[PDB]
UniProtKB/Swiss-Prot annotation, chain A:
The keyword Hydrolase applies. The lineage of its organism: Eukaryota, Metazoa, Chordata, Craniata, Vertebrata. Changing residue 299 to S: Loss of S-nitrosylation. Residues 1-317 are annotated as: Interaction with NR3C1. One of its GO terms (biological process) is skeletal muscle contraction. Residues 329-399 are annotated as: Interaction with NR1D1. Residues 1-399 are annotated as: Interaction with FLCN and FNIP1. Belongs to the heat shock protein 90 family. Residues 1-321 are annotated as: Interaction with FNIP2 and TSC1. ATP binds at residue 101. This is Heat shock protein HSP 90-alpha. The modification Phosphotyrosine is found at residues 21, 193. The modification N6-acetyllysine is found at residues 144, 159, 190, 286. It is found in: Nucleus; Cytoplasm; Melanosome; Cell membrane.
Amino acid sequence: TKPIWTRNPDDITNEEYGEFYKSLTNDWEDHLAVKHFSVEGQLEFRALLFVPRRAPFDKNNIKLYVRRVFIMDNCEELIPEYLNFIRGVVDSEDLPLNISREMLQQSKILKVIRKNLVKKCLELFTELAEDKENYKKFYEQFSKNIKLGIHEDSQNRKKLSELLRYYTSASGDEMVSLKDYCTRMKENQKHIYYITGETKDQVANSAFVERLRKHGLEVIYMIEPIDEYCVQQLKEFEGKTLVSVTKEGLELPEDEEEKKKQEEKKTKFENLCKIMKDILEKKVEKVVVSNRLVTSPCCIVTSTYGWTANMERIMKAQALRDNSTMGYMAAKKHLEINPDHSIIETLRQKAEADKNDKSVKDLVILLYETALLSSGFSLEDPQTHANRIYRMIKLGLGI
Amino acid sequence: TKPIWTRNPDDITNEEYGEFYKSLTNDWEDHLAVKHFSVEGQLEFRALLFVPRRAPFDKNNIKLYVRRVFIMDNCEELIPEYLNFIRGVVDSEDLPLNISREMLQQSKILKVIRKNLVKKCLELFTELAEDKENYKKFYEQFSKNIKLGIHEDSQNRKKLSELLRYYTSASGDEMVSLKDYCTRMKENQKHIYYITGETKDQVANSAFVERLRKHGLEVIYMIEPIDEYCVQQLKEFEGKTLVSVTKEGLELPEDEEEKKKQEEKKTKFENLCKIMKDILEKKVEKVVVSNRLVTSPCCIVTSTYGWTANMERIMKAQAMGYMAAKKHLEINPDHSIIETLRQKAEADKNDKSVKDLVILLYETALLSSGFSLEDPQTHANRIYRMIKLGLGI
């Protein structure tokens, strides 16, 4: 006949925790995990915390007692916003209730309680992650909560990052930790390669990954929207910096005899690049010979410090959400041509022979637009693109 | 020494209304329009309503007086939801005070005041509609509101519709009424053609209007997202019905002799149609000969009683299978590509050039509308193949 949270976790059964957690949330199924702990010293309290099995993404929810009597339901400073999916009870022995703003040790106590709550949640998540198959259940639900935390909590950011799991080009059907990706890196791989997109299947087969894959280098598939913000703050993991295969100037581990091989190509197609940058005008910033293509003739990459194809899609959809007008910035885009492709060699011949031919212009613009669609952007006037394609079909079929 | 809403509007200056509106709403600029009236038949009350200059965010804001003393701020049924941007004051003389919840309703007392407020608001909107550059100021702020009403207010739909203005294929740089569109139709046109899309320029050059435009027909450009919601309830105007150039089975007025001509084009290509309906498998529901294409070889149209291409573009903004917009592929019997395809395919329906061209054509017709591509890098590889053909590699 004592509260379930004053009892010692060693003397508490799973069915008792469960029917209690059901009791505190009307949830029809038992809890997914529980962390039950107490703290003494200057501050004394007990916390009984639960991770629910399903919790919606898209304001706190921990019951707060002082000396076994009820006080509040949503004390905001008890837990960050990104853990608000935790449900439970925190019972303190020394918190002051009557305060003026002059009194500031209410705040100090709450901060201590909060820091301990986060410490033990991160503990629990690290424990759950040691069991590979059951952690999937958790990450399935709160991977967005962890990434949100990585963005917001600078102090715990490393321990949150070790809780991340991603699909990669090496793992296929299984998601892996970052500390794993590091275990598969070569001795000449100085970077961690990621790609952002809207589906796994779209990023896995996109042009950006081509030479990276044939070089045997592993690529992380960040297919959730929150990733655009998460990776802004996850600058490096375990010493190695992360880079986007969608951004300009990819630093590929370049063996010497092949990358002077690549320097031949820079100068061979320097002329074609000038001609194309003039044909495209201010539709693009640069036209560059590529080092990340293998099978595709060209692709569109992003400026280092500006929006990504994925992020521009998100921003356009937000503008659309509140009828804001996309009126000032569109991702800076660079067009990369593949120095080893039949179409690009043919284009260099056609163009260096007559740089103002309406057919060369037509080809270069058609290439730009198809590279736009394959690289995650939307077309300005799609019917114009359709007319270019219908022309190439009539040519292909000799009309 | 008397409230303003008790004087009659002839003796009130625009600056007196202005100062009053400003004080009522804390607005930094004066009102855009004002309607001041009284009602004496069933119940006697005065109302002073204002239309603000720019449109509020998002519970109405009409102050309610009863026999010159103040009562409420958001009386629910005072004004329909879609008019909640109306600011002003209503002072009733015959208003029961100690009454209750179901009593107020059941008496049909607040419905009277509401009917009159909405009536005279629409009067105000009609009066403003008689001056293009001020109705422009108003329509700019509340065209979304008039639409909203076109959907909610059944008993007033006709009236609301005469306030609508759209860009059309005929009007160029100005928006026009529906009563306008109707005076310009030849007398064999039993339909009003509209198109929904993302920009004015995108719908103006879409394939769907090609034959409508060559044929001399006028089609309305519906470029705002609320429009998708609007025509769901906008039946017909001044007798003649609305049709989408994006939806299947376009019934355009055509000659008796043109009818037999299109039916001959219809039986010629039915073989090509079965061939494509099978190459595309589940990617579409039908392949049919088109009557709306002119220069483009094919286009994707959306089923009746089904979501639209544009509407699906908008709902994709937020992110499956609900209101599956059934897609049809319409082929132009008059196009070089479609005739050459009829030969290529009626000779070897299982050729891989025929397959590759057919899918490429389908995907391009998708992009020609509001659709997105399943796997875009796959389509890219098709385009590169075609290209390698045109250049000869």
